[PDB]
Design a protein around this ligand. Structure first.
Ligand code: HEM
Length: 408
């Protein structure tokens, strides 16, 4: 049964579209394909859905980019749908607007800036090689369970100085953050609340132990950056360390699954990467354009007209980031990975003050992954008649990616 809310008075019938972000029409064909169904040639730039508590969806890249760049008009006070889940959400600094946001982002950047991430290349490579060597000679693997859910998790837990045995419990919490269970807005709100509490419970003892600590791990480093000349308060620290884990452990996992399904179906593209290693390196941003996974929201600060659409204070707008990178008004043949594409502009990492703090780490993990994969498994395909299984929500997911090759 589908839960609908009635449109508010300011939403005209001609803008209503029945779009379920948590179970997109056509999702069985793929997450990106399903979002692309929404972006028809004449669809309005903003449409309103009665599902998921009732909310707007931006359907074109220029709006998505603009909204993310405009915190004074589109606030992060709520960035999840349904609203109940967005009100429960307590992660830092994603829930903050400038100026409150900026010292927290500065603290994170001390740990995640490009120069710091470059130091991690070798550690990341060792992890990738170890995993790949486990199955390269075999001629097959289930890429989800045997690689994409393993590699970024081992990388991040090592970087954070946390035990790899905590991977399962943390992944379960992440799932309920980004794809909360339930079929009513209130149920999904409760699910997110419970997940967010689980993260806080996990991180609290770590924070208490690492304040003033001598560890060189990511958490100690960021935690101990002063905020306006004093130690970071507990409330903020809980949300901050939780967000590191949420971003660090989930997002790259699912990005890799989408990417690899595509590459397994496009051996010509793989061959280009193998023949031209600089094309691989320089082409990673094109992969980010093509395989967006986040669809999150902003809160309309004031009654306004935006792109010819009347918005009321408190309205939520979902920003399906795939609809920027894949917008045919921004990129010709958008579903094609073209490693030499000069304009790769996208909002896979969003825009504006919150533009992904982990983007350098994400890029490095993907680059190293492709390098070490192709070194050992240069050619590969998706098993005949295999059907990956897709999930939509605030972060997309995919499972069942059986790959096959002739061992080299
Ligand atoms: C494929 C990989 C990734 C994608 C697509 C991605 C995407 C995003 C997006 C869209 C945002 C903006 C959220 C918003 O404000 O609405 C964001 C923020 C953030 N991401 Fe990522 N992310 C990725 C990997 C990572 C990694 C590996 C980390 C490491 C912890 C990370 C940490 C963060 C943090 C801390 C923020 C909040 C920044 C702020 O509020 O100023 N992300 N990410």
């Amino acid at each position: 049964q589908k839960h609908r809310v009635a449109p508010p008075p300011h939403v005209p019938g001609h803008l209503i579209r029945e779009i379920d972000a948590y179970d997109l029409d056509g999702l069985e064909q793929g997450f990106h394909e399903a979002w692309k169904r929404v972006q028809q040639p004449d669809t309005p730039p903003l449409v309103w859905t009665p599902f998921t508590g009732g909310h707007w969806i931006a359907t074109r890249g220029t709006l998505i980019d603009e909204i993310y760049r405009s915190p004074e008009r589109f606030s992060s006070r709520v960035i999840w749908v349904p609203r109940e889940a967005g009100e429960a959400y307590d992660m830092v600094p994603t829930k903050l607007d400038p100026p409150e946001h900026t010292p927290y982002r500065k603290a994170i950047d001390k740990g995640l800036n490009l120069a710091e991430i470059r130091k991690l290349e070798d550690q990341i490579r060792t992890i990738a090689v170890e995993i790949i060597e486990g199955f390269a000679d075999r001629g097959h693997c289930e890429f989800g369970s045997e690689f994409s859910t393993v590699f970024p998790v081992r990388v991040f837990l090592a970087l954070a100085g946390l035990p790899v045995e905590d991977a399962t419990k943390l992944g379960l919490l992440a799932n309920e953050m980004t794809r909360p269970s339930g079929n009513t807005p209130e149920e999904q709100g409760r699910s997110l609340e419970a997940a967010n509490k689980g993260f806080f419970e996990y991180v609290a003892p770590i924070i208490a132990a690492r304040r003033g600590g001598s560890g060189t791990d990511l958490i100690t480093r960021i935690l101990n950056v002063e905020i306006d000349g004093k130690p970071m308060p507990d409330d903020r620290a809980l949300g901050l360390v939780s967000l590191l884990l949420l971003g660090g452990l989930d997002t790259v996992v699912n990005f890799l699954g989408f990417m690899m399904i595509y590459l397994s179906r496009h051996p010509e593209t793989v061959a280009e990467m193998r023949r031209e290693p600089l094309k691989l390196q320089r082409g990673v941003e094109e992969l980010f354009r093509r395989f967006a996974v986040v669809s999150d929201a902003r809160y309309v600060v004031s009654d306004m007209e935006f792109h010819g659409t009347m918005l009321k204070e408190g309205d939520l707008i979902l920003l399906p980031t795939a609809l920027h990178g894949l917008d045919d008004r921004h990129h010709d043949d958008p579903m094609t990975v073209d490693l030499s594409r000069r304009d790769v502009t996208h909002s896979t990492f969003a825009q504006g003050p919150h533009r992904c703090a982990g983007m350098h780490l994400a890029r490095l993990e993907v680059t190293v992954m492709l390098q070490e994969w192709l070194a050992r498994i240069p050619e590969f395909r998706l098993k005949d008649r295999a059907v990956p299984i897709y999930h939509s929500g605030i972060v997309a997911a995919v499972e069942n990616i059986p790959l096959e090759w002739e061992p080299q």
